Amino acid sequence: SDFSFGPWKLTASKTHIMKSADVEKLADELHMPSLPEMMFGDNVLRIQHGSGFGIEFNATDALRCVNNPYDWTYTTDYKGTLLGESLKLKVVPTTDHIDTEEQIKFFEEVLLFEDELHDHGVSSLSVKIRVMPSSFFLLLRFFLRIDGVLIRMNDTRLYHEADKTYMLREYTSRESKIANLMHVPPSLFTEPNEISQYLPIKEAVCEKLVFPER
């Protein structure tokens, strides 16, 4: 299930969970004791150029950004994997915010991992992309609720418009202790596009991915 638009190539695969002994193997290769219950070690969302350069998302790469007594939450600040050889996107800092304020030509949502934290909450990494006639927008979201104690959300928004020679990658981290949210219905701890807006932004980074020349 793939798509192409002008200079761009979009590859995706949505598979199932890895084998049960298969991950004790990869748990060793990443050097940490446990992997999420549901490990889509084959799912990928990739966007590339006709000059090799581009960026992908997978759960193996994302999990190498979990700290290393370990992080049984699997909180990750992974922001994609750059592609290409001899021609790659360079990461420069910038002032350009992505203010999300237009018709959809293509869309898919790829799930990367999930874990239910021994039935005490949820921990999830997913990615969407909507492609449009003039641009494409993309969102890698880590979500974490621990039942009745806190919620954390790490979003990586990625955006590119046709005749700009750069994309924009915007990282935000939100977090709140749950006992600090007065009068929010419990359904909202399960709707992450709803609650996102009522949590404090702890961190925010804004880079610009300048393209190679020729």
Author numbering: 11 to 78, 107 to 139, 145 to 257
Give the article text.
The broad substrate specificity and cellular functions of PP2A are controlled by formation of diverse heterotrimeric holoenzymes; each contains a common core enzyme formed by the scaffold (A) and catalytic (C or PP2Ac) subunits and a third variable regulatory subunit from four major families (B/B55/PR55, B’/B56/PR61, B”/PR72, and B”’/Striatin). TIPRL (target of rapamycin (TOR) signaling pathway regulator) is an important PP2A inhibitory protein and forms a complex with PP2Ac together with α431, excluding both scaffold and regulatory subunits. We determined the crystal structures of mouse TIPRL and its complex with the PP2A core enzyme at 2.7 and 3.8 Å, respectively. Structure-guided studies reveal that TIPRL inhibits PP2A by perturbing the phosphatase active site, and together with α4, exhibits a robust activity in disassembly of active PP2A holoenzymes in a highly sensitive methylation-responsive manner.
TIPRL possesses a unique butterfly-shaped protein fold with two extended layers of β-sheets that pack closely and in parallel at the center. Several helical wings (HWs) arch outward to give an overall butterfly-shaped structure. TIPRL structure is very similar between mouse and human 35 and is likely conserved across species due to a high level of sequence similarity.
